[PDB]
C-alpha positions as CSV (number, residue, x, y, z in Angstrom):
1,G,134.2,-23.4,180.3
2,D,135.6,-24.8,183.6
3,K,134.2,-27.5,185.9
4,T,131.6,-28.0,188.6
5,K,130.3,-30.8,190.8
6,V,127.0,-32.5,190.4
7,Q,125.2,-35.2,192.4
8,V,125.3,-38.6,190.6
9,S,121.5,-39.0,190.8
10,K,121.1,-35.8,188.7
11,L,123.4,-37.0,185.8
12,K,121.9,-37.9,182.5
13,P,123.3,-39.7,179.4
14,G,124.1,-37.1,176.7
15,R,125.3,-34.7,179.4
16,Y,128.9,-34.8,180.5
17,I,131.3,-36.0,183.2
18,I,135.0,-35.7,184.0
19,I,136.9,-38.9,184.4
20,D,140.7,-38.6,184.7
21,D,140.8,-35.0,183.7
22,E,139.1,-35.9,180.5
23,P,135.7,-34.5,179.7
24,C,133.5,-37.3,178.6
25,R,130.0,-37.7,177.2
26,I,127.9,-39.9,179.4
27,V,126.7,-42.9,177.4
28,N,125.3,-45.3,179.9
29,I,124.1,-45.1,183.5
30,T,123.1,-48.3,185.4
31,V,121.6,-48.1,188.8
32,S,121.7,-51.3,190.9
33,S,118.9,-52.7,193.1
34,P,118.4,-50.3,196.1
35,G,119.4,-51.5,199.5
36,K,117.2,-51.8,202.6
37,H,117.7,-48.1,203.2
38,G,116.8,-47.0,199.6
39,S,120.4,-46.2,198.8
40,A,121.8,-47.3,195.4
41,K,125.0,-47.4,193.5
42,A,125.3,-46.2,189.9
43,R,127.8,-47.3,187.3
44,I,128.5,-44.7,184.6
45,E,130.1,-45.4,181.2
46,A,131.4,-42.3,179.4
47,V,133.4,-41.5,176.2
48,G,136.2,-38.9,176.2
49,I,135.2,-36.2,173.8
50,F,138.9,-35.8,172.9
51,D,140.5,-39.2,173.1
52,G,137.3,-41.1,172.4
53,K,138.4,-43.6,175.1
54,V,135.6,-45.3,177.0
55,R,135.8,-45.0,180.8
56,S,133.6,-46.4,183.5
57,I,133.0,-45.5,187.2
58,V,130.9,-46.6,190.1
59,K,129.4,-44.2,192.7
60,P,126.8,-44.0,195.3
61,T,123.8,-42.1,193.8
62,S,124.2,-39.6,196.6
63,A,127.8,-38.8,195.7
64,E,129.1,-35.9,193.6
65,V,131.2,-36.1,190.5
66,D,133.1,-33.4,188.5
67,V,131.4,-32.3,185.2
68,P,132.8,-30.0,182.5
69,I,131.1,-26.8,181.5
70,I,131.1,-26.4,177.8
71,D,131.0,-23.1,175.9
72,K,130.2,-23.0,172.2
73,K,131.9,-20.4,170.0
74,T,132.7,-19.6,166.4
75,A,136.1,-19.0,164.7
76,Q,137.7,-19.3,161.2
77,V,140.0,-21.9,159.9
78,I,143.2,-20.1,159.0
79,A,145.7,-23.0,158.5
80,I,145.4,-26.7,157.8
81,T,148.4,-29.1,158.1
82,P,148.7,-32.8,157.4
83,D,148.1,-33.4,161.1
84,T,146.7,-30.2,162.6
85,V,144.2,-27.4,162.2
86,Q,144.5,-23.9,163.4
87,I,141.5,-21.5,163.8
88,M,141.3,-17.9,164.8
89,D,138.8,-15.6,166.3
90,M,139.1,-12.9,163.7
91,E,138.1,-10.1,166.0
92,T,140.1,-10.9,169.2
93,Y,143.0,-12.3,167.2
94,E,143.2,-15.4,169.5
95,T,144.3,-18.6,167.8
96,F,143.6,-22.2,168.7
97,E,145.4,-25.1,167.1
98,V,144.7,-28.8,167.7
99,P,145.6,-32.2,166.1
100,I,143.1,-33.3,163.6
101,D,142.6,-36.7,165.2
102,T,141.7,-35.5,168.6
103,G,140.6,-31.9,168.2
104,V,138.1,-32.3,165.3
105,A,134.7,-34.2,165.2
106,D,135.1,-37.4,163.1
107,E,132.2,-36.2,160.9
108,I,134.1,-33.2,159.7
109,R,137.7,-34.5,160.0
110,D,138.2,-34.2,156.3
111,Q,135.9,-31.3,155.5
112,L,138.0,-28.5,156.8
113,K,139.3,-25.9,154.4
114,E,141.0,-22.6,155.3
115,G,138.6,-19.6,155.2
116,I,135.6,-21.5,156.5
117,N,133.9,-20.6,159.8
118,V,133.3,-23.4,162.4
119,E,131.5,-23.9,165.6
120,Y,134.0,-25.2,168.3
121,W,133.4,-26.3,171.9
122,E,135.6,-25.2,174.7
123,T,136.0,-26.8,178.1
124,L,138.9,-27.2,180.6
125,G,141.1,-25.0,178.4
126,R,140.7,-27.2,175.4
127,I,138.7,-26.9,172.2
128,K,137.1,-29.3,169.8
129,I,136.0,-28.2,166.3
130,M,132.4,-29.6,166.1
131,R,130.7,-28.3,163.0
132,I,131.0,-26.1,159.9
133,K,128.8,-22.9,159.9
134,G,126.3,-22.7,157.1
135,E,126.9,-26.4,157.4
136,G,129.4,-27.1,154.7
């Protein structure tokens, strides 16, 4: 759920990276021509899982970058507002509320109804509702 450091050379598209405190899905990794020593620089493009903003960074392939650790959990939608959604872990009674535009996957943005169970991802203290259980 927190973060960790990982060598740039080990990063892979589809995995994640933290750029400006924003957890982002890596969408492109370009490694330049290696120098006389074999060393190379990589340019990584990543998309914020929350703000959807595309960010790019350049690092020596031997360098380390911060990556977010994601936990997948289940909870139930207990309230829907014009601009937000609140879910609850029925057993622990914890509640999580987020804006629909940044805290819910585009795919299900308008498929949420109260009473349904969803799979949400959690990292860096924030959550993102990713899918509906039973799928629908």
